[PDB]
Design a protein around this ligand. Structure first.
Ligand SMILES: O=C1N=Cc2ccc3c(-c4cccc(O)c4)c[nH]c3c21
Ligand SMILES: [Cl-]
Ligand code: NA
Length: 338
């Protein structure tokens, strides 16, 4: 029972003393501990609910991390390092290096203000390089979202911004790592019918056309929008509504994808089965507009970012830019300047 076992001062595995709670998700909790058998190092321990599906995900996460961490022992590609795992009162507990705030929690604590463009550029490059390393190893993450991208160290400076009448926090160092490999799937493994957290889910996933590495690229494009704006451009908890928002932001779905899909519930003949005058229809009309209308500036660096996002949000997953190609996009040139 999760509440019974996650308390400050509790000691796990005769070595890890809980000092704080770092996060809680569907899966259980992540706590910060002092490791009394590694010289007092502070670590993060993910305590998994004793529930079938979360236990299975944790076991899978341990297998993937063992692979990724052995393949990349210097963490050149920025996947979180797993230190060990154990069981505590029947719960699986995974020990990680300690990181800073998730990118989501940073934005939340900053009043849902967005990141500045130079930080987005650096973060995007590192996200793309890390996930590309997964892709090179026959893996797809499937659950990329701001909560699963963590700052290495989230110290900030703070200043009033009169341009927007608000106190603003700015990272000192925006370096990141990628976490949460409990949904990561190898190319030759069973692919779950549904993947991703809704706001980051690709159209081939929604339409059950089959998914692979490209679905991670879509999620990354969605994450970059959220970093740029401070909010999602897909504010919905309904699949058909999500497709409608895609249409308004990105244009009509390709005919071949509507042709091929078994998800007939979404469609009336060859068009989305969508009433523009319903409550949901009025909201999508208010809340969505073409992608480039969300730009905050027409400066060329903003145009470069939006060009990349647009490529990442290509509907056809084969046509969609790969991460190897994304790393070569002009948006990143500023990082490669001598
Ligand atoms: O320092 C870390 N090293 C590995 C790791 C994994 C997850 C987390 C979260 C977290 C988890 C769920 C929700 C949330 O908002 C934050 C915070 N710190 C984490 C670490
Ligand atoms: Cl640029
Ligand atoms: Na239908």
């Amino acid at each position: 029972s999760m509440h019974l076992i996650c308390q400050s001062g509790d000691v796990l595995s005769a070595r890890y003393e809980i000092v704080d709670t770092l996060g809680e998700g569907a899966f259980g909790k992540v706590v910060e501990c002092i490791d009394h058998k590694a010289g007092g190092r502070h670590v993060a321990v993910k305590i998994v609910k004793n529930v079938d599906r979360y236990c299975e995900a944790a076991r899978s996460e341990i297998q993937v991390l063992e692979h990724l961490n052995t393949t990349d022992p210097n963490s050149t590609f920025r996947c979180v390092q797993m230190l060990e795992w154990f069981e505590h009162h029947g719960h699986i507990c995974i020990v990680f290096e300690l990181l800073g705030l998730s990118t989501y929690d940073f934005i939340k604590e900053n009043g849902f203000l967005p990141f500045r463009l130079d930080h987005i550029r650096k973060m995007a490059y590192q996200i793309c390089k890390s996930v590309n390393f997964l892709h090179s190893n026959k893996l797809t993450h499937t659950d990329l979202k701001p909560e699963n991208i963590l700052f290495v160290q989230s110290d900030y400076t703070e200043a009033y911004n009169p341009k927007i009448k608000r106190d603003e926090r700015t990272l000192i160092n925006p370096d990141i790592k990628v976490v949460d490999f409990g949904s990561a799937t190898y190319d030759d493994e069973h692919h779950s019918t549904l993947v991703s957290t809704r706001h980051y889910r690709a159209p081939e996933v929604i339409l059950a056309l089959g998914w692979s590495q490209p679905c991670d690229v879509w999620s990354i494009g969605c994450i970059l929008i959220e970093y740029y704006l401070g909010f999602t451009v897909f504010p919905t908890h309904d699949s058909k509504e999500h497709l409608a928002m895609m249409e308004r932001i990105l244009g009509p779905l390709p005919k071949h994808m509507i042709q091929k899909t078994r998800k007939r519930k979404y469609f009336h003949h060859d068009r989305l089965d969508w009433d523009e005058h319903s409550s949901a229809g009025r909201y999508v009309s208010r809340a969505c507009k073409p992608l480039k209308e969300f730009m905050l500036s027409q400066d060329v660096e903003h145009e470069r970012l939006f060009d990349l996002i647009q490529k990442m949000l290509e509907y056809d997953p084969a046509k969609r830019i790969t991460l190897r190609e994304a790393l070569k996009h002009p948006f990143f040139d500023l990082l490669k300047k001598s």
